[PDB]
């Protein structure tokens, strides 16, 4: 998957 | 320079009272302040300190927490409030000024005191070797004390102090840091020592020299006094 | 008239008449003082950190 | 390590705290050099500032606290003391416009300006050129042509043009046209306008200094 | 995808230029105390925060995106994400502080002398740091190294802040979008707008009580610098804060369009602020532009 | 009569003096001190930085105890500094902040300060009231005041931006002697170790040696091209060093009546702001408009070293009576103690 990102 | 003290008299045991001293003629805010007490026949002992900035307050362990020392620089007045004050707190108290810088003379001025009649370790011991010595005008006498620690600090000051208390008056500074004379002290006083053993010489002895001589240390609080040596003319 | 000029001559002739010593002897004296106080100087002779008060 | 020395450190930091408080007070006040030939010229402004060596006048206007340094009585070579003022906010410079008629004094004033406006210590420092004696200069212009001290002058012997030409013959002395600014004013007899001008010039010089402190200028 | 190459390249470049720029601003401002005015003290705090941005974001956002796995483990996830959020929050509040200091210095110039002291500057730095450390505490608390399995049949974990309740995450990212963008942005636009009016009214008064050509050009250059700072602040932060707000409300489909390369570019834009601020402040303040020459 | 007489007689005297000097110069200092081994490099470190001032320091002076120093800054404060601890012993609020000289009395009882207000204010450090108060306002100078130096608790020698130098009695507050022969501003003074003489540098590029008690100018020295901004006696009292804005220092010997050596370099176009000698006299330390102090071998006339640690004009440069340390005040507002 890997859907996302670190907030900043 | 004057230090006029009031707030004394009879107190019921275990009460409270506010001892006061109004300063006059000196920059009271510039000076640190000490209270010293004299039991009705024993020697001097230190009570409290408040520095020029009103910081670094210290008290003796024999009064710690029981008393509190405060000052009012905008009113040139000093306020030792005593709480829960016990029978062993009965003494003549003294307001004493101090100022700390290279070449200063702390404990130079002692106020006239106030009587307070209470209706009935880890410190430097000043082993003042002798209670009394007889002397005559023009004699010479050596007064000595031992400190439980060498007062020769790493900077090379020996924090020994000597006071004379003439009968019926408040103590006066004679010598500060072992070998410096106070302003207004005759040049015939001269102090010396090794840092741990000390002598005060009183050459060309005068009838004005009579009284009790108290040693004191300033290497560590509490500022323990010696028992005093009485000179009998 | 005189208070800046004749009084100046009276000063300058007093400076003229003063005794003088040869520059050779003045310099020899200066280097004799410099040698005589060689060890007396903590900057010429470097100072141990035990003797120097200004150590850390 | 310390025992009684700790109370000397307490005293030292109490002193440092008082020094810092007087450093705040000294930086909050604004420092004005006052310069110019003649006693009466400077005196006129010192008088109009509505609330023996260096004479220092303090005044508060619109909650700004001014220090004005009348150096005039010092009668000593500027080169050896003027560098005291390397950090003043403005140089108030007075010249009496009558001085053109009088024993060349206007040339002495222009030379003093050509120095003070170019002196290395004042390189970034504003100047407030107070032209004094407007009324006496108007009367003199009805008597004496301004060309009496300016051979190059060619224009009307009437107040406004003679004044403008003098103001140019000063402002063109400033080599440092872009570092300095020269806040020339004509002394108002009606009061409250002179110290208002000083306050506005000081305000604008504070603005320019803060712009440079911000690195915007 | 080929684009990870241009990621590697542009991240490497902006990392190098940021570590350089900030290290130079630090060495200049520490090694010349005559530079250390209130504004430069703030610029020191800014350059420190932008170096912290560079070190704690850039590798930890490239290499985890190049490998597509957070190799370093949960404690490094929590600590790095904390230092990211903190450095962002400090850098923002320091930009707001600089903008308000400048507004005092130009628009309220006499009152400014009352209160623009080094003691006030260090007070407000300590306050903004303590505040940012406080409000960023949710990052180590609720960031969890939530696992997945990658398509190679290897289990791999993703560092994701995941404050449990979805509406509570929407609330948190709304509050963050307000207090770290819209309030900073409105306050900075009010500050530089009023500085702009206070200079433009001076221009019109000069052209219509003394001015000079280079002193007008300086005012023009100031208006340019202020507009550029405002615009580049928006260009840097509005992309990432809107991406976050999208992830907050529209999570799955928002993340699908922006996962991978897009968010790598968006975060490189966000970190471009950390490079621009050394430039568009310190390295274009003429005082500093010379002091760096007088420095080593 | 006329200057066409008395200025010609004065010129014939000036020629007689210059001839006598050229007759007394049998060698320069270089060839005689070439017999002396070089001092080598003098590395020295800032052992203390005294950070208490807020504006430009103009003057500092070491006490005889080689421990306290006075320092004077246009923030309007004297600070007494314990150079061993950095402790501030006193900080005196000066009534006219534009001060550019101070001295610490050889007893340590008093400090003096003065500047663009002509007064040399004497401050009693050792009152019973424990504040520092003005004992005297020594008022009667007319120029700005450029140096004070105590001879004793009751006598101070003071130099002015007017023509004059003046010896004062503090107890009365009156000039006991005015020294008049300087045509320009008298920048600087130093008392000889005996306090029997002092030497005075002026902007007329002359130095004058004054008999404290007689009032007479004993000698003039004129080898400088411009203002003698600074002056110091060599620690034996037989010679003195004169710092000038001409970017040179010159050593003059009283018995030689003559310049012995000039300290200069092509790199050194900055003027000299202060000079003092190490206790041996072997090092002459000079402060400059360049943000440096140079250490000169007073005999060999070469740079032993440079005290680099300043970022503005070194305004004042005191060497302790012990030779233990060198104090370098600066327009940095920092006061750095060196050895």
mmCIF file of N, CA and C in Angstrom, chain B residues 46 49-59 69 221, chain D residues 6-7 10-11:
data_model
loop_
_atom_site.group_PDB
_atom_site.id
_atom_site.type_symbol
_atom_site.label_atom_id
_atom_site.label_comp_id
_atom_site.label_asym_id
_atom_site.label_seq_id
_atom_site.Cartn_x
_atom_site.Cartn_y
_atom_site.Cartn_z
ATOM 1 N N UNK B 46 25.471 34.316 65.647
ATOM 2 C CA UNK B 46 24.810 34.844 64.464
ATOM 3 C C UNK B 46 23.392 34.302 64.330
ATOM 4 N N UNK B 49 21.088 36.614 57.883
ATOM 5 C CA UNK B 49 21.712 37.523 56.933
ATOM 6 C C UNK B 49 20.729 37.791 55.804
ATOM 7 N N UNK B 50 20.696 39.034 55.330
ATOM 8 C CA UNK B 50 20.049 39.376 54.067
ATOM 9 C C UNK B 50 20.961 40.307 53.278
ATOM 10 N N UNK B 51 21.246 39.938 52.031
ATOM 11 C CA UNK B 51 22.232 40.647 51.233
ATOM 12 C C UNK B 51 21.650 41.934 50.652
ATOM 13 N N UNK B 52 22.516 42.685 49.965
ATOM 14 C CA UNK B 52 22.141 43.987 49.425
ATOM 15 C C UNK B 52 20.938 43.886 48.495
ATOM 16 N N UNK B 53 20.940 42.900 47.599
ATOM 17 C CA UNK B 53 19.821 42.716 46.698
ATOM 18 C C UNK B 53 18.594 42.061 47.283
ATOM 19 N N UNK B 54 18.579 41.815 48.591
ATOM 20 C CA UNK B 54 17.584 41.000 49.285
ATOM 21 C C UNK B 54 17.585 39.539 48.847
ATOM 22 N N UNK B 55 18.600 39.086 48.112
ATOM 23 C CA UNK B 55 18.778 37.675 47.848
ATOM 24 C C UNK B 55 19.705 37.001 48.842
ATOM 25 N N UNK B 56 20.051 35.752 48.519
ATOM 26 C CA UNK B 56 20.949 34.893 49.302
ATOM 27 C C UNK B 56 20.769 35.108 50.809
ATOM 28 N N UNK B 57 19.513 35.000 51.247
ATOM 29 C CA UNK B 57 19.212 34.943 52.671
ATOM 30 C C UNK B 57 19.833 33.692 53.277
ATOM 31 N N UNK B 58 20.388 33.835 54.481
ATOM 32 C CA UNK B 58 20.846 32.699 55.266
ATOM 33 C C UNK B 58 20.429 32.865 56.720
ATOM 34 N N UNK B 59 20.267 31.732 57.403
ATOM 35 C CA UNK B 59 19.957 31.708 58.826
ATOM 36 C C UNK B 59 20.838 30.672 59.504
ATOM 37 N N UNK B 69 13.988 36.799 58.145
ATOM 38 C CA UNK B 69 14.605 38.114 58.006
ATOM 39 C C UNK B 69 14.108 38.764 56.722
ATOM 40 N N UNK B 221 29.020 29.939 56.613
ATOM 41 C CA UNK B 221 27.875 30.066 57.500
ATOM 42 C C UNK B 221 27.589 28.721 58.166
ATOM 43 N N UNK D 6 31.326 34.974 46.989
ATOM 44 C CA UNK D 6 29.981 34.848 46.432
ATOM 45 C C UNK D 6 29.113 36.074 46.703
ATOM 46 N N UNK D 7 29.312 36.749 47.836
ATOM 47 C CA UNK D 7 28.582 37.991 48.071
ATOM 48 C C UNK D 7 29.118 39.147 47.235
ATOM 49 N N UNK D 10 27.355 38.500 44.029
ATOM 50 C CA UNK D 10 26.003 39.043 44.161
ATOM 51 C C UNK D 10 25.977 40.560 43.983
ATOM 52 N N UNK D 11 26.909 41.265 44.626
ATOM 53 C CA UNK D 11 27.050 42.706 44.412
ATOM 54 C C UNK D 11 27.375 43.051 42.962
#
